[PDB]
Amino acid sequence: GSSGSSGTAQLTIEAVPSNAAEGKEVLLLVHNLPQDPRGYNWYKGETVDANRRIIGYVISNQQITPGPAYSNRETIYPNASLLMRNVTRNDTGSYTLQVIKLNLMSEEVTGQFSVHPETPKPSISGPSSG
Template sequence: MEPPSAPGHRGHVPWHRLLLAVSLLSFWNLPATAQITIESVPFNVAEGSDVLLLAHNATEDTLGYSWYRGERVENNQLIVTYRIDTQAYTQGPTFSGRERIYPNGSLLFQNATQNDTGYYTLMVTKNDLQREIVTGLLRVYHPVAKPIVEANSTTVTEHEDTVVLKCLTNDTGVSLRWLFNGQSLLLAERIKLSQDNGTLTIEPVRREDAGHYQCEASHLGNSSKSDPLRLDVKFDSAPGSSSGLSGGAIAGIVIGVLAGVALIAGLVYFLFIRKIGGASDQRQLTENKSSDFNHSK
């Protein structure tokens, strides 16, 4: 009969590889006097994740395993039992459908809840019917809530404005850190954090400060990041110039305009003189023709 299993969970971890390695070490490499121990993997788990109560130091002379909720072996607190030789299991009164027991005695919780927090007892029954009992602790915490980043302004002017960013979270006891464009923020003389890291101040702001800011809240091995907040920094291409053009560029434009005006004026003058000269020559030619005509009469 197959070990009990819960419905598939999206965040399921491939525990079978870890269990195989542990089983091999347990049977081949450990001394016969080694005591059964329980390890929570991970040690602290966020609600909704999977967690394994890993049984160490299982031996070949084991007949079966029984898991109980609490610190004592009580039938009304039985979760599940597993017999190795027949591969048979029996569900107890506290079995929720999310537990799965493995042939080496380890117990997997899928989609753990805060109600799963507490002590669990493993009873190992040997082939000679001797029993070994060990207790372990499972800790399940609320996942860290997604923080929010707020700013006094998201569009600022270089060298003039001060930016104040705040990381807002309803969780207590969390650690905060800041990220800039997806990387850990590097502090500088202008860039400072409050004592609790909840407030980031940039004074004065510079163009290189433009980008995306996030804060990350973490607690007991799980964390959550805020959505990115974009900061835009306005700046002049040349400081001290309202037009954005250097003095040399302005002088060049003025000289070019004056040269163009002079060229046009010269061209107009040339055409005007040429027109006047052409009219005078035409009048003189007409007079000469008239005089020659009179003489011929």
């Protein structure tokens, strides 16, 4: 799993796929992860606030604490990744992911995706509003 010698590195997140459809699943992978991630913490939006916290996992004690923005549809990974099942057009937006290190420190990386309504439009008339 090479990465790249030429050029600095920085924790990032790549959605996989990059654009799914309502009801589909999206796995947000991560790269340039820290040495020892004390615990991962995902959030809903562009802020690391509990009021928007989705789910947090602590490797130290291997504990899981779902936030208010939890719907029991997401799942964290040992690589600081989060799997979003049965996604929705609403989910689309921003997903901040902070990684805490044993050094009592933490990072920040906004990793989200886009969801498009991949469904047919059975209209007898034709031209409609929406």
